[PDB]
Design a protein around this ligand. Structure first.
Ligand SMILES: O=C(Nc1nc2ccccc2s1)[C@H](c1ccccc1)S(=O)(=O)O
Length: 154
């Protein structure tokens, strides 16, 4: 409602829907989900319409955080409506900045989600060709960064 955040990755089937679900849980547990619009989107069109990769679901189920999303690509409107667009890596950041320069209204602050990590792990690497441990690392990064971002936005 008041505040809004859009998490962004390459496909919007793993890193960003995980961040979105982690963040939504955090605000729900703190009684303030009503004050937040939370969403996720992709820089690419590779996965439009698809659900989160089941490898990410396996990880999320272990941690007891339900995750549901239909992959969608970032749009021009997103720059106008979101307070924060938080992405995973330097390619995402570059692509988002490119798209932001094509619109009249950019309300969004566009940043690396990892810039909020107290442990300074700046990049949330694509685990597509990784193993279970890589998905777990992404999850842990999302938890740390989402907590810090909620605490105090840049
Ligand atoms: O979409 C993803 N990676 C992609 N890798 C390729 C490689 C070749 C062609 C298209 C793509 S999209 C990532 C991801 C997706 C699923 C599982 C883990 C990570 S995501 O960005 O975290 O969703």
């Amino acid at each position: 409602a008041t505040k809004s955040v859009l998490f962004v990755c390459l496909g919007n089937i793993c890193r960003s829907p995980i961040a979105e679900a982690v963040f939504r849980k955090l605000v729900t547990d703190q009684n303030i989900s009503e004050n937040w619009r939370v969403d996720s989107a992709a820089t690419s069109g590779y996965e439009i319409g698809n659900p989160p990769d089941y490898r990410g679901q396996s990880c999320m189920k272990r941690h007891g955080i339900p995750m549901s999303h239909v992959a969608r690509q970032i749009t021009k409107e997103d720059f106008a409506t979101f307070d924060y667009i938080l992405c995973m890596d330097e390619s995402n950041l570059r692509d988002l900045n490119r798209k932001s320069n094509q619109v009249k209204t950019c309300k969004a602050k566009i940043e690396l989600l990892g810039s909020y990590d107290p442990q300074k792990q700046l990049i949330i690497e694509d685990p597509y060709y990784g193993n279970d441990s890589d998905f777990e690392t992404v999850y842990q990064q999302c938890v740390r960064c989402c907590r810090a971002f909620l605490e105090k936005a840049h």
